Amino acid sequence: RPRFSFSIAAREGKARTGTIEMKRGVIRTPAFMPVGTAATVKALKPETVRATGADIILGNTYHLMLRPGAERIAKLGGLHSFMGWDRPILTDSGGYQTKQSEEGVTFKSRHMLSPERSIEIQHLLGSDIVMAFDECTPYPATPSRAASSMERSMRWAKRSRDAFDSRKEQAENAALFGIQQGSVFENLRQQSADALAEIGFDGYAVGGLAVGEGQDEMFRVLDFSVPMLPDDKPHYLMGVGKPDDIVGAVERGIDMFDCVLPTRSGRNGQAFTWDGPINIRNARFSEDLKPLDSECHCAVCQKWSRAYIHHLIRAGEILGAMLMTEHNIAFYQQLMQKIRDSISEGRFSQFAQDFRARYFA
Amino acid sequence: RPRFSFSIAAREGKARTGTIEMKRGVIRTPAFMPVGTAATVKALKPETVRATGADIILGNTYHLMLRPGAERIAKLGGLHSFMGWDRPILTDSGGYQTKQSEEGVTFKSRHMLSPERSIEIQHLLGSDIVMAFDECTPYPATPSRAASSMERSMRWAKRSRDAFDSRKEQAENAALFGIQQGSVFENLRQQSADALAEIGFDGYAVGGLAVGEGQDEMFRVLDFSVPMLPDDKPHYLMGVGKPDDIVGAVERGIDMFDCVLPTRSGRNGQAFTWDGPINIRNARFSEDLKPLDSECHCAVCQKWSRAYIHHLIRAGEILGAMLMTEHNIAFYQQLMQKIRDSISEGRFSQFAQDFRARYFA
Ligand SMILES: Cc1nc2cc3nc(N)[nH]c(=O)c3cc2[nH]1
Ligand SMILES: Cc1nc2cc3nc(N)[nH]c(=O)c3cc2[nH]1
Ligand SMILES: [Zn+2]
Ligand SMILES: [Zn+2]
């Protein structure tokens, strides 16, 4: 396989479906990435993550640098070996997680991150898709502060590029994505886009969203923001999101996604279904022999009832967290597959309308 | 298969190896039963429990009556269906877990257990091996109190027998075990044995042990206690125990075992190895690429390092509990297989000596 190759196989409006080829495997787009911030997708074995259909998982520079240590993981053979996932891994750079200066950020032991240190940690982890070190701009932000923050992030983007490129092994076997900032402001988003494209990356993330602005506002920004990015490279919406966020985002040109919701909300009792989420702890499920969802093909829905999973979660049993998470990740992957197939078949717009009609009914 | 058939295939001294045939499957003896007190073997899917080699698991009347409810589980199709384990299940009767009288015991909602109610709950759960409702005598016990308690338990034994037999479906498809009491006193143990044999059961448990008396004292009581039981029926030592307890107990004639140690101690960081237990949280394991145990054939030892599992447990990750438990249950099942094979081959005494020499070195 090449280091990195993104190919678009079919389009409908702004939506795209295709593949990213990397040395460690292929990634079908639009893609959902399960989050595994401490070198584990919570409550799942990697083989289970894979069985659900995930092509790639996300790791986090910040968390792994604190525990178990980036150098430690390198010494042990890298993150893939350590956690037993041999397919691509994307690592966030820490920019979402202090003493701040133009040089970087110190967290308090006390810990330092910068473009250089972030990129190095990602190299020590052995990540396949490396994210530029940025500042995710808090929301709401005044235009001045959004601009200052965006500007610093673009300088940090160039520093991330150069650090990555200065490491032969990394530059030859991994990919590097830039992150667009600019808050909700079109001109800032354009300036950031231009800056990133001038540097040049393998992929472009839309950063700074999902941090309190609401879906209508998020979609609005995506409306003008994604067309600013190079069309021929993947578009990644960081940390998004609920099933309906994902559908709308793909409608606006997004190709990649990650979110803690399927895992986190699973362990707390929320199960995604095609009729909308349910909280399995609700007394109405105590004697419901139906599976979590009526159509889901996952192993959990093949074998156990709502009633059982209800008992498990109420009892605080670990099996409840395992089953809830396997289902929700599988659900998310089935959503992604339905999106890919519908775009490939030229009926994605219909799919999204039908989806919304049922999910919200 | 028959309702119940125990056959002994080979003996060495007091040790026996053979099989219990039941409608839901065969149980190889000497047997270790993983404990699953809230309708789950903690942190394992039933298919995983089975993959480790377990033939049967234990459930608990007391816990299941409180949560989720015995009647509820019957309404939902029984415990096998509910939790997805289709092989035999043994249920303890509640006698180890108040207002006490000759009639039974009230716990505080407020909850009542008696021979009749206990047996009925076990029927509602659909258990395959039903345990008589008893009183586990606290240790230490004076001879008078041990006798009074033992005597009450024998009366309760007859009541358990009659309740079981009064339920056609139960009597035809499940088995019933009596429990010997008598604390540490030979004459009381003999009297209890005689009483149980006079009633007649499919199996005989040694109760009242592992409740603080120490291995030397436990073995001493087993020395005279197990020969008192009918030789041609299984001998079950309730709640025992560590690997070395199990070896010594088989040397004294015990055929069946259950204990929370492999699961509980797993989630707390203790891993069983042929060189003795280790606590994986210990800093000395932080960069140890070796599997938990050097010979273990389990999937965990095939795929992950001590270092990784160390990280998981220290991080409080659910995967750490899952992997620790799978290994420890598999370890326990490999121990049972080595015991069965060595008795079958007439070299069990050598096996136990070699075992002790390494486990304690
Ligand atoms: C929900 C959400 N998660 C996010 C993660 C992010 N990471 C980076 N590096 N940069 C970001 O801007 C960023 C934004 C996010 N929003
Ligand atoms: C460690 C241990 N677990 C036990 C469970 C028991 N259950 C019953 N019914 N009766 C018992 O005597 C009994 C004794 C036990 N010892
Ligand atoms: Zn499902
Ligand atoms: Zn193992």
Side-chain angles (χ1 to χ4, degrees), chain A residues 1-74 76-98 100-107 109 111-144 146-197 199-263 265-361, chain B residues 1-74 76-98 100-107 109 111-144 146-197 199-263 265-361:
Chain A
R1 267 179 300 260
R3 178 191 67 89
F4 188 87
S5 189
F6 179 54
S7 175
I8 301 180
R11 309 187 145 258
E12 175 174 348
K14 292 191 169 180
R16 311 100 69 76
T17 185
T19 50
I20 298 165
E21 299 171 65
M22 304 195 69
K23 280 172 198 219
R24 290 188 162 100
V26 181
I27 304 150
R28 303 171 284 179
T29 66
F32 182 80
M33 298 184 277
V35 177
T37 80
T40 163
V41 174
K42 291 186 197 296
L44 299 177
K45 281 175 182 183
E47 60 198 84
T48 308
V49 180
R50 172 61 181 171
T52 68
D55 294 325
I56 165 161
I57 65 173
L58 176 148
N60 223 286
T61 296
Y62 172 83
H63 299 275
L64 291 174
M65 95 184 275
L66 299 175
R67 178 154 60 189
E71 279 84 359
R72 174 163 288 170
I73 284 171
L76 292 179
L79 181 55
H80 292 88
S81 191
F82 187 58
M83 73 181 290
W85 172 270
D86 64 15
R87 277 176 183 277
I89 292 170
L90 186 143
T91 45
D92 198 2
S93 53
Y96 179 86
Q97 291 72 42
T98 65
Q100 341 207 353
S101 59
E102 187 59 23
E103 279 312 288
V105 64
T106 305
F107 296 95
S109 350
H111 294 270
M112 189 274 298
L113 245 10
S114 60
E116 293 80 19
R117 180 49 180 163
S118 188
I119 297 316
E120 182 191 28
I121 289 165
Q122 288 184 71
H123 171 63
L124 288 163
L125 298 175
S127 331
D128 305 279
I129 298 175
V130 178
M131 298 306 294
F133 183 76
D134 67 329
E135 145 159 67
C136 169
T137 305
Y139 179 84
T142 66
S144 169
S148 298
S149 163
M150 178 277 283
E151 287 163 9
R152 164 169 288 169
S153 289
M154 301 301 95
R155 291 187 298 269
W156 281 3
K158 173 56 177 167
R159 284 169 59 189
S160 295
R161 179 82 254 186
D162 291 347
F164 177 96
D165 285 342
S166 90
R167 201 164 280 104
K168 188 154 197 286
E169 191 190 322
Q170 190 166 37
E172 287 174 14
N173 292 290
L176 183 68
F177 283 26
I179 313 174
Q180 184 208 222
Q181 301 292 351
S183 194
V184 297
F185 310 107
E186 186 168 18
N187 60 333
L188 262 31
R189 286 274 175 191
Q190 186 62 72
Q191 291 165 198
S192 175
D194 294 338
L196 292 180
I199 295 161
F201 291 92
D202 296 307
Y204 302 86
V206 180
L209 288 175
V211 291
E213 74 277 1
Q215 190 185 80
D216 295 348
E217 181 83 334
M218 185 177 69
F219 281 178
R220 175 178 93 71
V221 179
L222 289 169
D223 283 343
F224 55 68
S225 290
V226 186
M228 300 177 175
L229 307 172
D231 180 72
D232 69 340
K233 309 206 108 61
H235 308 156
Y236 168 34
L237 182 53
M238 310 192 73
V240 179
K242 305 161 225 89
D244 48 308
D245 292 328
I246 288 167
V247 172
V250 167
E251 293 178 288
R252 287 163 182 80
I254 296 308
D255 309 295
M256 295 169 62
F257 302 93
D258 80 271
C259 181
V260 309
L261 170 69
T263 37
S265 87
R267 312 197 288 290
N268 290 300
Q270 178 180 57
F272 292 101
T273 79
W274 295 110
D275 303 290
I278 62 174
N279 197 294
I280 201 67
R281 303 179 58 101
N282 191 292
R284 67 185 198 268
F285 295 118
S286 58
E287 287 178 2
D288 188 346
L289 287 164
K290 294 189 300 303
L292 292 172
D293 173 275
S294 60
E295 285 171 29
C296 180
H297 298 100
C298 93
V300 177
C301 290
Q302 169 206 328
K303 315 174 170 244
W304 293 278
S305 61
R306 282 164 179 199
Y308 177 60
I309 294 165
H310 169 92
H311 159 64
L312 252 27
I313 298 288
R314 319 262 298 206
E317 283 289 346
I318 290 160
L319 187 56
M322 297 162 46
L323 298 179
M324 286 288 292
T325 299
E326 180 173 352
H327 162 79
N328 280 347
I329 292 306
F331 177 89
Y332 264 66
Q333 298 295 339
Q334 281 160 98
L335 168 67
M336 301 324 299
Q337 188 60 55
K338 283 181 200 285
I339 295 174
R340 297 193 288 262
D341 288 332
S342 65
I343 299 163
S344 303
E345 291 181 8
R347 54 178 179 86
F348 171 58
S349 119
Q350 188 57 234
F351 170 79
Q353 183 177 284
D354 297 349
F355 168 82
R356 287 189 272 264
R358 223 241 262 207
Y359 195 73
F360 295 126
Chain B
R1 267 179 300 260
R3 178 191 67 89
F4 188 87
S5 189
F6 179 54
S7 175
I8 301 180
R11 309 187 145 258
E12 175 174 348
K14 292 191 169 180
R16 311 100 69 76
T17 185
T19 50
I20 298 165
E21 299 171 65
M22 304 195 69
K23 280 172 198 219
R24 290 188 162 100
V26 181
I27 304 150
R28 303 171 284 179
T29 66
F32 182 80
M33 298 184 277
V35 177
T37 80
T40 163
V41 174
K42 291 186 197 296
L44 299 177
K45 281 175 182 183
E47 60 198 84
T48 308
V49 180
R50 172 61 181 171
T52 68
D55 294 325
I56 165 161
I57 65 173
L58 176 148
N60 223 286
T61 296
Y62 172 83
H63 299 275
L64 291 174
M65 95 184 275
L66 299 175
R67 178 154 60 189
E71 279 84 359
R72 174 163 288 170
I73 284 171
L76 292 179
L79 181 55
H80 292 88
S81 191
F82 187 58
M83 73 181 290
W85 172 270
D86 64 15
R87 277 176 183 277
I89 292 170
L90 186 143
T91 45
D92 198 2
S93 53
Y96 179 86
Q97 291 72 42
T98 65
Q100 341 207 353
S101 59
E102 187 59 23
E103 279 312 288
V105 64
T106 305
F107 296 95
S109 350
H111 294 270
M112 189 274 298
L113 245 10
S114 60
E116 293 80 19
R117 180 49 180 163
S118 188
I119 297 316
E120 182 191 28
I121 289 165
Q122 288 184 71
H123 171 63
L124 288 163
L125 298 175
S127 331
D128 305 279
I129 298 175
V130 178
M131 298 306 294
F133 183 76
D134 67 329
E135 145 159 67
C136 169
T137 305
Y139 179 84
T142 66
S144 169
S148 298
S149 163
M150 178 277 283
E151 287 163 9
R152 164 169 288 169
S153 289
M154 301 301 95
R155 291 187 298 269
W156 281 3
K158 173 56 177 167
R159 284 169 59 189
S160 295
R161 179 82 254 186
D162 291 347
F164 177 96
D165 285 342
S166 90
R167 201 164 280 104
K168 188 154 197 286
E169 191 190 322
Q170 190 166 37
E172 287 174 14
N173 292 290
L176 183 68
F177 283 26
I179 313 174
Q180 184 208 222
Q181 301 292 351
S183 194
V184 297
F185 310 107
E186 186 168 18
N187 60 333
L188 262 31
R189 286 274 175 191
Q190 186 62 72
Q191 291 165 198
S192 175
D194 294 338
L196 292 180
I199 295 161
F201 291 92
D202 296 307
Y204 302 86
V206 180
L209 288 175
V211 291
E213 74 277 1
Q215 190 185 80
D216 295 348
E217 181 83 334
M218 185 177 69
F219 281 178
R220 175 178 93 71
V221 179
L222 289 169
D223 283 343
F224 55 68
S225 290
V226 186
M228 300 177 175
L229 307 172
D231 180 72
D232 69 340
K233 309 206 108 61
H235 308 156
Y236 168 34
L237 182 53
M238 310 192 73
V240 179
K242 305 161 225 89
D244 48 308
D245 292 328
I246 288 167
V247 172
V250 167
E251 293 178 288
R252 287 163 182 80
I254 296 308
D255 309 295
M256 295 169 62
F257 302 93
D258 80 271
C259 181
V260 309
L261 170 69
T263 37
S265 87
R267 312 197 288 290
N268 290 300
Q270 178 180 57
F272 292 101
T273 79
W274 295 110
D275 303 290
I278 62 174
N279 197 294
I280 201 67
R281 303 179 58 101
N282 191 292
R284 67 185 198 268
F285 295 118
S286 58
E287 287 178 2
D288 188 346
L289 287 164
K290 294 189 300 303
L292 292 172
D293 173 275
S294 60
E295 285 171 29
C296 180
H297 298 100
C298 93
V300 177
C301 290
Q302 169 206 328
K303 315 174 170 244
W304 293 278
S305 61
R306 282 164 179 199
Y308 177 60
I309 294 165
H310 169 92
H311 159 64
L312 252 27
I313 298 288
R314 319 262 298 206
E317 283 289 346
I318 290 160
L319 187 56
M322 297 162 46
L323 298 179
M324 286 288 292
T325 299
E326 180 173 352
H327 162 79
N328 280 347
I329 292 306
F331 177 89
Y332 264 66
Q333 298 295 339
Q334 281 160 98
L335 168 67
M336 301 324 299
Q337 188 60 55
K338 283 181 200 285
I339 295 174
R340 297 193 288 262
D341 288 332
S342 65
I343 299 163
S344 303
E345 291 181 8
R347 54 178 179 86
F348 171 58
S349 119
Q350 188 57 234
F351 170 79
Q353 183 177 284
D354 297 349
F355 168 82
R356 287 189 272 264
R358 223 241 262 207
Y359 195 73
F360 295 126

